[PDB]
Write a structure and sequence with these properties.
The structure is cut from a larger assembly and holds chains A (about 130 residues), B (about 270 residues) and C (about 55 residues).
Chain A (H helix, E strand, L loop, with lengths): L1 H4 L4 E6 L2 H14 L15 H8 L12 E6 L11 H9 L2 E2 L4 H4 L13 E2 L9
Parallel strand pairs in A: 1-2
Antiparallel strand pairs in A: 3-4
Chain B lengths: L2 H53 L8 E6 L11 H11 L6 E5 L1 H8 L6 E6 L8 H13 L8 E8 L7 E7 L2 H5 L15 H68 L4
Parallel strand pairs in B: 1-2, 1-4, 2-3
Antiparallel strand pairs in B: 4-5
Helix pairs in contact in B: 1-6, 4-6
Chain C lengths: L8 H11 L9 H7 L4 E5 L3 E7 L1
Antiparallel strand pairs in C: 1-2
Classes of the chains: A alpha+beta (about 130), B alpha/beta (about 270), C alpha+beta (about 55).
């Protein structure tokens, strides 16, 4: 996807989902016998994501003004946004779209929790 | 799943259980108070209605004014709902009545069903035991803004507190100035034809017998709130016991899991 | 008191006097409940209609 960004073009990458990636990384490490951390995860299962998600950028004019936009996906168990990985990634990103079965099954689709959901780039990233 | 989530759910339940177990007792604080104004009410009924009993006062058949009484305060079982029943039941045998609602819960119970009928509405009611001053002014506004004394029939609706354990939505008539005159045995009385005794006695009665309904409806409600909160805080108590088991398990599995996590972190 | 009030109001006006000139010593808890009210009223048509005045 970076090729597009690096040559005056614009890509949009979707990581569906990053939860499963994190599970894969924990497997490697445990089998490499690298010592585990919180929830049996590697000691830097934040850096994993933080380095990945910093690669989505908007380049300067001197670089051709190209862009990589990212939409990572994370999956929660019972809506627990307090959990290790969901928190890690909430911290990395520029905002979040929260989806809820409670709203979904009430007919509301997409099940976007309007209160919690923000796009910090905001009205600067939106048609006038 | 999370100890935090279970901690909050256990607190809001026990809190509910204080709220209801206190409203249960704030009711019993008010329970004796309720029987004072209840017998005193039924006592003036015996005193003030015995005239009309003796005059054989009945409805001139020559357009009704229906007055419903409850309260602004909810959480009292089916005080509001089954008075609304009996008022609808009555609104089938004469659909065209004007409705005056005293209390906010009977207002919206009836506003759901016959929103065209309600034509005046009294607020800030359930809070204390009922008074003549309230009655008389609501009465005064009934005469003024509603033209009560032009109605072929006037009806009061309230719940009559049969027991301490159950109540019964009842209905009572108010006879106007004309209706008092044309009663059969009205002549039996040497009312001085000078003052319009029929006008003043109507005005006095309208106020007086609204207060009797109010005092009675009030009492029955107190018992409904005593009984409803008796059930609520018992259910809540039952929830607490269950959740206290679920809290205690999650309490432990959260200690266990942290420890396994730590112990694993030194497997090397 | 015609082109104006009613017998029961006309009677409540005098009814406050007895209560509010009974020595404070025993103007009781329940006694003051009788001498003021919180009631409001709102007229209606079709949904609400006119203003919500005090009593």
């Amino acid at each position: 996807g970076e090729w597009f960004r690096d040559n005056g073009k614009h890509a949009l990458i979707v990581y569906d989902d990053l939860s499963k990636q994190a599970v894969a990384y924990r497997q490697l490490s445990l089998l490499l016998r690298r010592p585990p951390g919180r929830e049996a995860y590697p000691g830097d299962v934040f850096y994993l994501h933080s380095r990945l998600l910093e690669r989505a950028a908007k380049l300067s004019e001197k670089e051709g003004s190209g862009s990589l936009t990212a939409l990572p996906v994370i999956e929660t168990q019972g809506g627990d946004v307090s959990a290790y990985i969901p928190t890690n990634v909430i911290s990395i990103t520029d905002g979040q779209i929260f989806l809820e079965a409670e709203l979904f099954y009430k007919g509301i689709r997409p099940a976007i929790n309007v209160g919690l959901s923000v796009s910090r780039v905001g009205s600067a990233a939106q048609v006038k | 799943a999370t100890l935090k989530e279970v901690e909050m759910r256990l607190k809001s339940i026990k809190n509910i259980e204080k709220i209801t177990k206190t409203m249960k007792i704030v009711a019993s604080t008010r329970l004796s108070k309720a029987e004072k104004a209840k017998i005193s009410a039924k006592k003036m009924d015996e005193a003030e209605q015995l005239f009309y009993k003796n005059a054989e006062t009945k409805n001139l058949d020559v357009k009704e004014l229906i007055v419903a009484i409850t309260s602004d305060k909810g959480l009292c079982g089916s005080i509001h709902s089954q008075l609304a029943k009996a008022v609808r039941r009555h609104l089938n045998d004469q659909p065209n009545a004007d409705i005056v609602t005293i209390g906010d819960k009977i207002k919206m119970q009836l506003l759901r069903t016959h929103p065209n009928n309600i034509k005046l509405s009294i607020n800030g009611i359930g809070k204390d035991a009922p008074t003549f001053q309230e009655s008389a002014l609501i009465a005064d506004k009934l005469l003024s803004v509603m033209k009560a004394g032009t109605y072929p029939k006037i009806s009061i609706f309230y719940n009559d507190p049969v027991s301490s354990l159950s109540f019964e939505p009842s209905e009572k008539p108010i006879f106007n100035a004309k209706t008092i005159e044309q009663s059969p045995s009205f002549g039996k009385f040497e009312i001085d034809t000078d003052a319009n005794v029929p006008r003043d006695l109507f005005e006095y009665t309208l106020a007086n017998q609204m207060l009797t309904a109010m005092a009675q409806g009030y009492a029955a409600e107190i018992s409904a709130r005593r009984n409803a909160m008796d059930n609520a805080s018992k259910n809540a108590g039952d929830m607490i016991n269950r959740y206290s088991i679920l809290y205690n398990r999650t309490r432990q599995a959260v200690i266990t899991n942290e420890l396994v996590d730590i112990i694993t972190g030194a497997s090397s | 008191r015609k082109a104006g009030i009613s017998y029961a109001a006309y009677l409540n006006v005098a009814a406050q006097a007895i209560r509010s000139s009974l020595k404070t010593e025993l103007q009781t808890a329940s006694v003051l409940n009788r001498s003021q009210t919180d009631a409001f009223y709102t007229q209606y048509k079709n949904a609400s209609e006119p203003t919500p005045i005090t009593k």
